[PDB]
RNA sequence: CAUGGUUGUCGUCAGCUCGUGUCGUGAGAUGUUGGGUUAAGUCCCGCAACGAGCGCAACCCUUAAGCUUAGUUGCCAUCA
């Protein structure tokens, strides 16, 4: 659960923004300032993750899954790779507008992809005009793209991963609107309220993406 | 100038809309904007939008060249 703070600041997660770019709700969880730059109080930062670390593992001895976003490319292998560590999903590429409170609509083009997988092996993208082979196979190359890792999403996901709250403001919008629990990574210059369990660690190191991850992935992986 | 049916017209112009979602107290907006491109909301890239339909293509006829079948009522090369 807990992380060892030295594990931290070789992290980078220390780190936080410029004080130009602050929100000043962040002030309970910002302990003073380096080069302009507001440093995280890593004392802080670990209590609040071993917090989201005890949901975490709830939500998966409960059964539920996590949505795990951060279309970041900072943040895009990290989310990737924590989330088949944990068989959970990852959202990589453009966030769908309404991927959640359309899924009425999503859920046609998400079955669209087992859907592709299924004329290949019945026959159909065999017989084919020619310019129809192309056409369906670049139908398939876009829903791979953003759909890849929710494809076996179902129903609403029990909780949801940001890793960067300021960046995908879009998917929070749709969790706080369906009553989704999320748990967040924030910097600095984003809204601590928006989101519910909170990670007061940096966004930008690829490290420290990476070493978060994998303990809120080491989360579910104590509880299924 | 009650109408069905049929027709011109803008104009073969490329636009016209819908479902779910989202923003807006609301009329409304988005998608249908932006970066390019096309004869074409034609196509791509991105983008609170995700998908559709009537539209535009294509599909259908004729034409331009070729190959099989066919030899009359077509044709006339090898020959009289």
């Known amino acids: 659960a807990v992380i060892s703070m030295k594990q931290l600041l070789e992290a980078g997660v220390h780190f936080g923004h410029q004080t130009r770019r602050w929100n000043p709700k962040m002030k309970k969880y910002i302990f003073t300032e380096r080069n302009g730059i507001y440093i995280i109080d890593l004392q802080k930062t670990v209590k609040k993750v071993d917090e989201a670390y005890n949901f975490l593992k709830q939500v998966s001895e409960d059964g539920g899954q996590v949505l795990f976003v951060g279309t970041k490319k900072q943040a895009q292998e990290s989310v990737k790779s924590e989330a088949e560590r944990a ?72 909780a949801l991963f940001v890793v960067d709250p ?8 749709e969790a706080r609107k369906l009553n989704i629990p999320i748990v967040g990574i924030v910097d600095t210059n984003c809204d601590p309220d928006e989101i ?29």
């Open 196 to 224: 519910d369990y909170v990670i007061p660690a940096n966004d930008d190191a690829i490290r420290a993406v990476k070493l978060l991850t994998a303990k809120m992935a080491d989360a579910i992986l104590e509880g299924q």
């Open 166 to 173: 300021r960046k995908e403001r879009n998917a929070i919008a």
């Open 87 to 158: 068989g959970q999903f990852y959202i990589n590429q453009r966030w769908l507008g309404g991927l959640l409170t359309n899924y009425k609509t999503i859920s046609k083009r998400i079955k669209r992809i087992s859907e592709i997988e299924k004329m290949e092996e019945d026959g159909l993208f065999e017989v084919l005009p020619k310019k129809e082979v192309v056409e369906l196979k670049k139908e398939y190359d876009r829903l791979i793209k953003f759909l890849g890792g929710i494809r076996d999403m179902k129903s609403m996901p029990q």
